[PDB]
Amino acid sequence: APVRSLNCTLRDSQQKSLVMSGPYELKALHLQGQDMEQQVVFSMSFVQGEESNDKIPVALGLKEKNLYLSCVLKDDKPTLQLESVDPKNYPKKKMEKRFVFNKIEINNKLEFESAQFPNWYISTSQAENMPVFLGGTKGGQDITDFTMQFVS
């Protein structure tokens, strides 16, 4: 059948919101009130992959855009990018591995591990207005925990 998708927003555990802030750029900042329309709406697709009760493979597309979060090596490091795709072919159930995150539910928060790069996570910085990135530990000063808000 089709792939199933939900519209949502994400906020880091410090309650920073995610925004598009440059051609292919995702940054995190403290947002409230009028400025909250600026936040990125995701289409979270439930994709093929290894699954358990608390670990669910997803893709993260930007709502009604042919753009996906993806994990690739750049200058020899696992990095997070926004990657364009052929809009005729996406989303699909069998997303390529660079697009797949393991959505992990621990203590009422979510972590998004790269399926391609084990123990690399979607991360934010403590500082305002810095890139969303792929970080190689769910420990330390960088933030790896999120909450999801369901959108109409």
User: Under the rule (CB under 6 A), what is the footprint of ligand S8J?
Assistant: 24-26, 69, 80-82, 131-132
Two tokens, residue 105: 């539910």
Shortest Å distance, C-beta 70 to ligand S8J: 8
Query: Is the CB of residue 125 less than 8 Å from the CB of residue 142?
Result: yes
Shortest Å distance, C-beta 66 to ligand S8J: 14
Which residue's C-beta sits nearest to ligand S8J?
Answer: 131
DSSP secondary structure string for all residues of 41-102: PEEEEE-SS--BTTEEEEEEEETTSSEEEEEEEETTEEEEEEEE--TTT-S-SS--GGGEEE
Two tokens, residue 10: 């994400």
Nearest C-alpha neighbor of 136 from the set 122, 150, 147: 122
Q: Which is nearer to ligand S8J, 80 or 104 (CB)?
A: 80
Shortest Å distance, C-beta 64 to ligand S8J: 17
Q: Which is nearer to ligand S8J, 25 or 54 (CB)?
A: 25
Q: Which is nearer to ligand S8J, 131 or 136 (CB)?
A: 131
Shortest Å distance, C-beta 82 to ligand S8J: 4
Give φ, ψ of 4 to 5 degrees: -95, 140
Shortest Å distance, C-beta 135 to ligand S8J: 12
Q: Which is nearer to ligand S8J, 23 or 118 (CB)?
A: 23
Strand 67-74 to strand 26-29: parallel, antiparallel, or no bridges (unpaired)? unpaired
Query: Is the CB of residue 27 less than 8 Å from the CB of residue 132?
Result: yes
